[PDB]
Every structure is written in structure tokens, then in C-alpha cells.
Design a protein around this ligand. Structure first.
Ligand code: NAI
Ligand code: FMN
Ligand code: SF4
Ligand code: FES
Lengths: 430, 213, 85
């Protein structure tokens, strides 16, 4: 197959994504959830991992790591320490709201995925980490977990399979850095959200020193549907090494901002013109698009026309798919002010542990405020490029790269605009 | 917002604070959630519960938490100062938070913030004289397709306009509570021009299951 | 640790007194500020014995190799868990 897009309503995993149907257990079992879970838990952890590997599923957190191999890293005999699945629902990245809708409207899919993933690697329990500000969503998730506990689907003798599995929900306290896996592991343990170093990987030492697998909500909530419908069905969508469907959040200067499920290799223009209702002012009014939320570099109007929305088609376009969150800025956007706001956001939500991010993100914030005011000479554009190169690749976690990338994208695609703004300020001031 | 504490007469270690017995039961459930040998892992929810009891965190809830959980109080101070959701200063009854990140600044959240500021007669980080409102500026709140938006305590108010949010503040000043949702024609996250997808009914159980399962 | 590479020969410290006029430190030792650098211990011993100086030799102290691991900060049942990071 070469042409992609227009996923049929029968092939969408997340029915009741918009909240139009019942989200409780009666509404969940009327749509396909909790079906033949005893057979899934009885067929074997190796069988579940093989079904995940054959599906070609990559991590929907933003890294794109193949989930089959990552979940197969935990398939080792236990040395007496317990093993844990941790589902991460922090979702502090700007532009991203898919996991909030998944928690609010489909909690039973999430907890069925938790049970299947726990069986897949022999986990003892599940610690669903949710954002501190998602109070009503966490309460709905707790209500659904109570409903599943009272019906015997999870807990002691889970689904009549003899498997022992608990689900726990913890709440954050408003820190975007806690979305990182090792930082989340440190935050669960009663410490600050300062990320650890790798090695050790979480499969060797994770929460409480136990083996732990951190997984996104979107890469967990599809595992029961992958195990039920089949791995090849999930691999029949998208290009090679980009198999499956994806939730896309279109926001910004668009007619209808919305969250929509779609095929993986849909063109960005087709996605905007079909589900968002079009760019505000038409497609000719488009200036820039951030493809995957604030961590990924932007692309201008000319590049954005013929680019598919998957991992490889954006990696070859020197950007990333990220959280698959499309932010659209039309020609009325002061793009320098938007990128300066992004650098300020990364300045605020930095744990400050390792010094290149702790100093240089504030450094780029200061020079970007000066760039927005236009109070500079053209040499510090290249100096800022050198600084962003000095941060990218010399930090503990990947927030340094996520703060360096928008600066580099803005420089590379819009240095004439910076130069004319700065020379206009220099002419009007002196 | 300073990260060092001076012993004011209103905020001292001798300030009375203690947990109600039902909050003690909830604290013991929180502790029972975690494995033995790692009772320090319950610093976050017990501190959040203490804030929800008191409204803010003086330096008497932190040492009470440190005494209850058997941890050094410096670790509780670190946890309280790291996270932005812990109020070490007494905020008003309604904690208004306006998100001004780029997906919300593109949809003109500055108009909403200006309308709130010139409605309440205060600025960002300031409280009303009668201690009823507190307006601060936050980062992204996970509802970017519902931009612009504000959060009041645990309630998300989304798809707001200056007139609508002025009416929301007026409803809160009268003692009423508004409905925490999007205020336009959309319900949760669908397009305002109707459903582009998922217009078919869900197929129900047993559909498309592979052979041999 | 670049200053702990070469052996040094020094001398004992004799009397230093204060100057009556200006309070400076006067001394009568000609060998007060004289040190010598040797590559090995044996060369220093040979140089000291050649000039007829009675010498005291104290052995080189080198730090033993420790056992440092990053994963010990997050142990599951050991006392080496860090309180904070
Ligand atoms: N979804 C969101 O809200 C956000 C997503 N991101 C995205 O996240 C990505 C960066 O995150 P990372 O976790 O650092 O990505 P990646 O370096 O770590 O790895 C992803 C996962 O694979 C595991 N892994 C990788 N190599 C491994 C190996 N050899 N052995 C064992 N396990 C291994 C890691 O432990 C991790 O759990 C970027 O693509 C960025 O765009 C960034 C910010 C926010
Ligand atoms: C600063 C930072 C914040 C992150 N926040 C999230 C997040 O909120 N949700 C998420 O799924 N991944 C987030 N990640 C990515 C995680 O490190 C990790 O890739 C993800 O939790 C698991 O990926 P997976 O989909 O393969 O399981 C963040 C990474 C960094 C560096
Ligand atoms: S890059 Fe920044 S957020 Fe990440 S570990 Fe270093 S200081 Fe913390
Ligand atoms: S940018 Fe405002 S809710 Fe995300």
C-alpha cells in the first residue's frame, strides 16, 4: 500500500473517544472491552510479547522505541525482587491532550491493557502515575478500577486466570519533568522529580530498586485490541516500521481544534483539511507547523505540504513525530514570541540537576527575550546556535534536547526574520 | 515566592496543625498502598491531603508529615519546594490559574487574563483584599485543543471568552459553582462542526477476534 | 593529583623570629627554603647519602581502588539507599 489516510470507523481502537457513550463497565463491555481476557492471560507472556512484536508497535510516548523489544527486556526469571509495570499519564507536553481523553472516557481499556502488560512480563502490580491537575480524570479512573475490582476482573484470581495483579493510582504535584521515566520513578519513591542516569536501565533497577517497565497510556490501551484482533491487523496500517493507528491533537490557529484517531502515514495537509476543518484563513495563510508538540522542531509552509505524519517521514525532514500533536501557526503569528514562550516554558519546568540545562536554558531564555525585542546584533544568532549545540547531547535526560530543538528549528528556518527585526530595532533606536 | 523560610508569627513551627481522624485513616490507606521498607514513598499524597485539609502548607504540616512517616524534615522541605502544586503561602479560597503556553497564547489567552485582571482589580500573583480569589499564571494544563482555558481549584473551565469568564467569576462571587467543562457548543474535544469520525456505532464484543484465541 | 608524582627532599625548620624594626620574619637558616625533586626514592637516598645528610624516608601513600556503582543508590534491600538525589 502507498496511499494512506481515511481510517474507517470499524478499525478505530478508541471507540467512545469523544465521550458520547457510557464510560463505565456496562458501557465498556457493550463495545468489546474485557473480552476473553482469561484466554489472553492463559496463552502465555511469550505469546503476548510475540503478538506485540508482530504488530510493529512503537512507543507512543514520543521516543518511538519498539514496544515489543522493550517489554521483552523484562522477560527474565526473578531474583526475589518484585516486578512492576508503571503506566505514565503525566502528559505535561504542550499541544498534547490525548491521554487525558483516554483516562476520562476509556479507563477500562487502560486497566485491561495494564492487566495484559502485567501478564506479558510477570509484573506484580501497576502504578498508574497521573498528573496532579487531572483530579476528575483520576477520580474517574479510580471509579473504573473499583468497578473492575468488584467484578473480579483484576485483583485476586484476576479474570479466573490465577494471576495476581493489583492496580494503583498515584498523583503528581505539578511538575512536567516528572513525565520522564526515571524522573517518574524517583517521584513515585517520595523524592524530587530528578531523573536518574542510564545505565542502570529500569528493567534492572527501577521503582524501589525492583525491575520496572514505564509505558505510555497510548501504548498500553491498544495491547488488548492487538491481542484480540491480531498483530497483523495492527501491522496492516501505515508504512513499514510505522505500523498502527495514532491519536492526533490538532491545535493552534485552526478552524476546529480536535483530537482524532487516524492512520499513521496520513499527510499533514490531508489531516488538517479533513479533521480540523482547515487552517484559519485557508491553506495559503499557513506559516509554520510544529509536528509533535513543543519538543520537536517546527517546519515551515513549503516543507509542510507533502510530508506524511509518521516517524521516518519526519526524521528525514529534520524533525520528529513526538506526541503527534500538530500546532498550527498562520501568518498572523509572531513566531519569535511563540518560540521564546516555549523556551520560557522549558526554563520553568527544568529540574536543575545537571548543569548544561540548568544554566543554558535560562541563557537561551534571556537571549530569546532580547531577540523578540530585537536588541541584538547578527553574531549572537550563530552564538545561540553554538549554545544549543552545546546543550543537545550533554545532559542527563532529554529535556535538554527538547529545549534545544525549537531554537535550532527557528534559527534554521527563520533567520531572515530575526535579522530584519533586529536591524529594524537597531535603526529605530539609534 | 522565595525558597527559604523565615519564622513569621503566622508561620512558625509552633503553629497548631493536626490531622482529623478520617484523614488519619486515609493516610494509613496511602501508607498501606506502598511496599514495606519504603514508607517514605507516601510523602506526596499525605502532603497533598494535608494541603486539602488546611488550604496551604505552613511549616507545621511538613514536620508533622516527617514525624508521621519517619523521614528527615529536610526531605519534606525539598518535596514541598520542588513541586508547584504545594502552596507554602496562604492563597485565597479560589485559586484561578491561567495557562499561557504557546498553544493557548495562539488562541488569545492574554485577553482572558486581561479581562480577569481588570474585573477583579488585581494583577498576576496577587489576591483580593477579602481573600476570595488568587490569580496566577501557569504552564500547559493538558487541554490544548480546548484553548484558551483556566483552572479554578479542581475544575477545568475551557473554551472561554472574556464575557463568559466574567460571568463565571460573577457566579463564583455569588457562592454558586459553575459546570467544569467547555463553554462552547462542543462537549469534550470534538470539532465544533460536528463529528468527523466515530459516527458509526461501536461493534460490540466478539468482533474481529483472531482464530485460535 | 599531579603534585604527588615526584619525591621531595626538604630540611627541618629552625628558628624564625620577628624583626625589631619592621616585624618581618628573620631567620638564620641558609637551608630554609631549599627543596629538591627526585624521580624515585633510591635517587633521593643516594643523593642524601652522597652529601652526608642523615635522612628519614616516609613511604608513598596511594589510595586503594574503591567499588563505585551508580545502581547502589537505589538498592531494594540495602542500607545504601540515598535519601535524596
Ligand atoms: N510524550 C511526551 O509528553 C513527551 C515526549 N517526548 C519525547 O520523548 C523522547 C525522549 O524520551 P526518552 O525516554 O529519553 O527516549 P529513549 O532514549 O529513551 O528510550 C525510550 C525507552 O526505551 C528504553 N530503552 C532505550 N534503549 C534501551 C536499551 N538499550 N536497553 C533498555 N531500554 C532501553 C528507555 O529506558 C525508555 O524507557 C523524544 O522522542 C521526545 O520527543 C519528550 C517530551 C515530552
Ligand atoms: C522531560 C520529559 C517529559 C516527558 N513526558 C512524557 C509524558 O508526559 N508522557 C509520556 O508518555 N512520555 C513522556 N516522556 C517520554 C518518556 O521518557 C518515555 O519515552 C515514555 O514515558 C515511555 O515511552 P514508551 O511509549 O515507549 O513506553 C518525557 C520525556 C522527557 C525527557
Ligand atoms: S536536562 Fe534539565 S530537566 Fe533534564 S536532568 Fe538535566 S537539569 Fe534536569
Ligand atoms: S498549552 Fe494551554 S492547556 Fe496546553
Amino acid at each position: 500500500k502507498t496511499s494512506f489516510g481515511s481510517l474507517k470507523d470499524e478499525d478505530r481502537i478508541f471507540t467512545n473517544l469523544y465521550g458520547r457513550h457510557d464510560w463505565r463497565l456496562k458501557g465498556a463491555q457493550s463495545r468489546g472491552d474485557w473480552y476473553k481476557t482469561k484466554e489472553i492471560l492463559l496463552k502465555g507472556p511469550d505469546w503476548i510479547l510475540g503478538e506485540v512484536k508482530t504488530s510493529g508497535l512503537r512507543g507512543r510516548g514520543g521516543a518511538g522505541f519498539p514496544t515489543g523489544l522493550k517489554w521483552s527486556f523484562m522477560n527474565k526469571p526473578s531474583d526475589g525482587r518484585p516486578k512492576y509495570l508503571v503506566v505514565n499519564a503525566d502528559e505535561g507536553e504542550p499541544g498534547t491532550c490525548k491521554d487525558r481523553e483516554i483516562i476520562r472516557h476509556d479507563p477500562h481499556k487502560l486497566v485491561e491493557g495494564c492487566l495484559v502488560g502485567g501478564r506479558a512480563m510477570g509484573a506484580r502490580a501497576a502504578y498508574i502515575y497521573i498528573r496532579g491537575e487531572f483530579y476528575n480524570e483520576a477520580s474517574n479512573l479510580q471509579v473504573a478500577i473499583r468497578e473492575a475490582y468488584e467484578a473480579g476482573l483484576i485483583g485476586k484470581n484476576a479474570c479466573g486466570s490465577g494471576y495476581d495483579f493489583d492496580v494503583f493510582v498515584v498523583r503528581g504535584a505539578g511538575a512536567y519533568i516528572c513525565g520522564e521515566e526515571t524522573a517518574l520513578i524517583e517521584s513515585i519513591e517520595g523524592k524530587q522529580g530528578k531523573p536518574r542516569l542510564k545505565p542502570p536501565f529500569p528493567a534492572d533497577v527501577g521503582v524501589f530498586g525492583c525491575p520496572t517497565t514505564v509505558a505510555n497510556v497510548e501504548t498500553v490501551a491498544v495491547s488488548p485490541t492487538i491481542c484480540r484482533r491480531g498483530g497483523a491487523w495492527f501491522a496492516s496500517f501505515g508504512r513499514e516500521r510505522n505500523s498502527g493507528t495514532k491519536l492526533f491533537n490538532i491545535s493552534g490557529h485552526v478552524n476546529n481544534p480536535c483530537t482524532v484517531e487516524e492512520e499513521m502515514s496520513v499527510p499533514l495537509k490531508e489531516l488538517i483539511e479533513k479533521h480540523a476543518g482547515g487552517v484559519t484563513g485557508g491553506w495559503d495563510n499557513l506559516l509554520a507547523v510544529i509536528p509533535g508538540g513543543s519538543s520537536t522542531p517546527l517546519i515551515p509552509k513549503s516543507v509542510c505540504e507533502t510530508v506524511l505524519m509518521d516517524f521516518d517521514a519526519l526524521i528525514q525532514a529534520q524533525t520528529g513525530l513526538g506526541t503527534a500533536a500538530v500546532i498550527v501557526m498562520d501568518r498572523s503569528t509572531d513566531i519569535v514570541k511563540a518560540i521564546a514562550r516555549l523556551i520560557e516554558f522549558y526554563k520553568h519546568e527544568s529540574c536543575g540537576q545537571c548543569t548544561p540545562c540548568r544554566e543554558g536554558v535560562d541563557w537561551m531564555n534571556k537571549v530569546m527575550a532580547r531577540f523578540v525585542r530585537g536588541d541584538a546584533r547578527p553574531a549572537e544568532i550563530d552564538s545561540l546556535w553554538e549554545i544549543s549545540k552545546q546543550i543537545e547531547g550533554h545532559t542527563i535526560c532529554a529535556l535538554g534536547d527538547g529545549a534545544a530543538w525549537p531554537v535550532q528549528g527557528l534559527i534554521r528556518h527563520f533567520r531572515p526574520e530575526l535579522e530584519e527585526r533586529m536591524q529594524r530595532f537597531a535603526q529605530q533606536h539609534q | 515566592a522565595l525558597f527559604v523560610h523565615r519564622d513569621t508569627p503566622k508561620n512558625n513551627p509552633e503553629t497548631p496543625f493536626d490531622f482529623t481522624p478520617e484523614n488519619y485513616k486515609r493516610i494509613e490507606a496511602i501508607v498501606k498502598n506502598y511496599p514495606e521498607g519504603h514508607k517514605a514513598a507516601a510523602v506526596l499524597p499525605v502532603l497533598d491531603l494535608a494541603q486539602r485539609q488546611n488550604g496551604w502548607l505552613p511549616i507545621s504540616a511538613m514536620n508533622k508529615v516527617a514525624e508521621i512517616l519517619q523521614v528527615p524534615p529536610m526531605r519534606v522541605y525539598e518535596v514541598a519546594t520542588f513541586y508547584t502544586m504545594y502552596n507554602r503561602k496562604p492563597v485565597g479560597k479560589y485559586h484561578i490559574q491561567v495557562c499561557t503556553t504557546t498553544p493557548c497564547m495562539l488562541r488569545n489567552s492574554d485577553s482572558i487574563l486581561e479581562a480577569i485582571q481588570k474585573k477583579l482589580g488585581i494583577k498576576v500573583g496577587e489576591t483580593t483584599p477579602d481573600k476570595l480569589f488568587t490569580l496566577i499564571e501557569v504552564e500547559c494544563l493538558g487541554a490544548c485543543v480546548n484553548a484558551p482555558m483556566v483552572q479554578i481549584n479542581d475544575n477545568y473551565y475551557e473554551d472561554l471568552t472574556p464575557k463568559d469568564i466574567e460571568e463565571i467569576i460573577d457566579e463564583l462571587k455569588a457562592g454558586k459553582i459553575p459546570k467544569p467543562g467547555p463553554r462552547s457548543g462542543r462537549f469534550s474535544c470534538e470539532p465544533a462542526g460536528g463529528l468527523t469520525s466515530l459516527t458509526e456505532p461501536p461493534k460490540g464484543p466478539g468482533f474481529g477476534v483472531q482464530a485460535g484465541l | 593529583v599531579n603534585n604527588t608524582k615526584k619525591w621531595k627532599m626538604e630540611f627541618d625548620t629552625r628558628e624564625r623570629w620577628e624583626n625589631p624594626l619592621m616585624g618581618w620574619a628573620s631567620t638564620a637558616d641558609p637551608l630554609s627554603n631549599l627543596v629538591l625533586t627526585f624521580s624515585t626514592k633510591e635517587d633521593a637516598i643516594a643523593f642524601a647519602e652522597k652529601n652526608g645528610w642523615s635522612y628519614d624516608v616516609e613511604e608513598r601513600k596511594v589510595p586503594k581502588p574503591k567499588s563505585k556503582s551508580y545502581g547502589a543508590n537505589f538498592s531494594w534491600n540495602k542500607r545504601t539507599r540515598v535519601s535524596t538525589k
